[PDB]
Design an enzyme around this catalytic site. Structure first.
Site, PDB file in Angstrom:
ATOM      1  N   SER A 143       0.849  -1.180   0.000  1.00  0.00           N
ATOM      2  CA  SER A 143       0.000   0.000   0.000  1.00  0.00           C
ATOM      3  C   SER A 143       0.889   1.235   0.000  1.00  0.00           C
ATOM      4  CB  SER A 143      -0.943   0.011   1.210  1.00  0.00           C
ATOM      5  OG  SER A 143      -1.652   1.236   1.283  1.00  0.00           O
ATOM      6  N   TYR A 156      -0.317  -2.363  10.060  1.00  0.00           N
ATOM      7  CA  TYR A 156      -0.473  -2.357   8.610  1.00  0.00           C
ATOM      8  C   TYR A 156       0.722  -1.697   7.933  1.00  0.00           C
ATOM      9  CZ  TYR A 156      -3.096  -2.390   4.236  1.00  0.00           C
ATOM     10  OH  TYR A 156      -3.521  -2.641   2.954  1.00  0.00           O
TER      11      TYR A 156
END
Lengths: 262, 261, 261, 244
Positions: A143, A156
């Protein structure tokens, strides 16, 4: 007639959202695809039919990516059904939001294992065949959180940064071969994961106004003020797996509308 | 053919990377305007090779340092083909020298051609692109725009600045149908890198081109292979595609693992 | 003190970040030469402030655009104090404008001052440092050298180029006692940033400086606070300290988190 | 009085090498230091004295950072003996060189757990006290491998990249407070683990090692008041490794 005709593709966590989009765009580009989920669903046939609409051979498999034995089972199933795994898309990714102070340790462990160690297991199990066959494409779905930080997303961000680092190492270890490793770094993508976030933000600060809540949500991080589509991510993956990217090794393809450009 | 009917301009594209970018853009269906400093007797043949793909391809002679000639080129393309929709800034010049003895003239030339000319072209093309609602600006930077190399201070600085300008332009067009991005190639097989390798062979390896080429590649590229111009063109086509709507202000690095270490 | 006996030259140090860096270098025991474009009646006062720390202090008026005046400054420092052992390239300007209407003269001046001046100063100073075997070349870049910002195309390109130049210089001197590093400040509480905030307050917030400052900081700096010139000076002192002998070609980012997101 | 006088610091994985250097340079700055090791050794006493040579209170704790309970035991021991943890240096880490094909799974897990997750545990346990006190420093000893890749170090590079990402997130979560989180990224450091010139010449352009003392100097810089606005960034001491 299509760039990826005859390529066997395996996308982890591809029964929903971004993984499903990547699988769809790969099948559109002419590649056989093996969809992966945790456990079977009544709609498995519907999703498989949707992907098969592109004329490629489509299969489905239910393997928990946390267990390495099940990852090996997935690879062997692909090898039996369609032949050697040629394109590996490490997409399995979950999210949990919490400040570092109150982030559960089990949730951190799960995020790290699924986003980081599962890609390691799949890459380790698929590399020997790609080396034997002189061609391969390891595509890791990172990401923007793998390039920059964001509040309340420690697990994350750490997992995605580590996935980018593992991409770099795998690309370097295969630099003199027909195997490339690269990462995709999308921004916000409209999905259930993000629709629930939008609804929660509407409950919190915008009082059930969907349009304003979404507009503010995008205005915070993405300068484009628009959502990245799963099709765009899949098109980036198709480009990575295309012959034109034979020398694209160990880098990132960032589809974010400006998030990491500031 | 994802670029049918698109009007594209490639600066400094009579040879090397710009030529391959023009060819690949032609394959996608876009009319392409080549460019070089001066007219050549080779214009007919090169333009024909590019035109082999059934697209209206033209040739123009202009000095990218001079903004007047850039304006001339833009109006030439607007009237001969149509409004400019895909802009490619391919900068070519390079001078290798340590900082102590780097000529001021060549430093100025490198900065003006690698950086300022792209700014002039982007500034001139943006109004039409905003009017039309669509635009793809691709700056052909280098891996030197992401990391440093000895004896390439001017080149590295100019390419870094080009990437920064790419980011600013992308941010200034974020909400439009205009994207700006950069492509960063490593050592790429081209006559200029061949001149560099010939210099290396004469200086260090008794003029042996194979040995000098291997030494050149293994220094910076883990792949130990050349990035080809066709790959740079493919990356440019990927960026310029309408499907790259949400790719803004980023670098597409084609370097065989150079920057990964 | 840490830098006792070192001779330092800080460019554009009559106010703001440069003055803070000069003050903190002198506080570390270094002799300092301040530089300005035009001589000012305030010069003496500024000198006094720096001289409060007990080192030798001098002042010189020379615009870094002209390389001849840069060499004049270097030889003035050598005459008065000795060999230039620390070189802080800080002379910087800003012009906020969209790319579409960005004046060409302002772009040229921004590139020249923020990038070329550092090149000239480093080129003139490197030989002496090589002879002596020790040196520090600290370039004052910005966060704009690491990321993009709207209406700062020239500034961002110049600072990115400065970072690239820092990398190349640090690589060309890796085996010597000379290091080249860049500092990347965020919004720093200076007269220039106050002028910018006043402009935005008048144009957007009806003259409310509090509201303008809140919007200014919250847009870019997660700390919602300013970086002080003392802090930039402390980073420069750390880079010039002996502990930084193996800090080469990197960035010390002092920005309250601007680049962390 | 010294720049860090009065601060209580915990340096994990500091029985030798980089951690010991960091601890000693923090002590030189006036800080009180708690060293940590996986297990007790005789050297403990010796090491405790060496740091203590700089006139600061020094303690030692044996605790495997892979176990959260032992991490909390270490933190509570520091609170018992010296006081609240004001500086936290997450430095425990190990290496295992192997291609991805044959990288042992348990080694991968151990590297991830010690280089990344132990930092998470320590930071999570320490943050409440730093917030209540209103001042804190979290320095994560990453590597150049947190910024670039290296062959046969997949686990290490992944763990260090993740540590840097965690540093960014923490810094963002504490941005409007007196707590900064930053990461040091050293290159090749002179530690137990003609050939030397070949070994260095590939990755470090300086062709020279980085010292543990220099890592400690960078940590002292990050912990000093001049770094109050340095948040979520990397201090890279690598002799030019990442500049190419």
């Amino acid at each position: 007639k299509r760039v990826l005709s005859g390529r066997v593709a395996v996308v982890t966590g591809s029964r929903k959202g971004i993984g499903l989009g990547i699988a769809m765009r790969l099948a559109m580009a002419g590649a056989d695809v093996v969809l992966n989920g945790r456990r079977q669903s009544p709609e498995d046939s519907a999703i498989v039919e949707k992907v098969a609409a592109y004329g490629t051979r489509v299969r489905c498999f239910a393997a928990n990516m946390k267990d390495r034995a099940q990852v090996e089972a997935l690879i062997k199933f692909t090898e039996k059904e369609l032949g050697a795994v040629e394109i590996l898309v490490n997409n399995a990714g979950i999210q949990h939001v919490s400040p570092v102070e109150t982030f559960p340790s089990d949730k951190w462990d799960e995020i790290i294992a699924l986003n980081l160690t599962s890609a390691f297991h799949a890459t380790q199990l698929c590399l020997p065949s790609m080396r034997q066959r002189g061609w391969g494409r390891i595509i890791n779905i990172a990401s923007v959180q793998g390039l920059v930080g964001s509040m309340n997303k420690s697990a994350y961000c750490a997992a995605k940064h580590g996935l980018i680092g593992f991409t770099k190492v795998v690309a370097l270890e295969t630099a003199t071969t027909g195997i490339t490793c690269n990462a995709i770094c999308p921004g916000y993508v409209y999905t259930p994961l993000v629709e629930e976030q939008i609804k929660a933000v509407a409950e919190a600060k915008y009082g059930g106004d969907m349009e304003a809540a979404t507009q503010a949500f995008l205005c915070e991080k993405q300068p484009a003020k628009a959502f990245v589509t799963v099709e765009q991510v899949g098109d980036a993956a198709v480009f990575l797996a295309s012959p034109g990217a034979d020398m694209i090794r160990g880098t990132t393809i960032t589809v974010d509308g400006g998030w990491v450009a500031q």
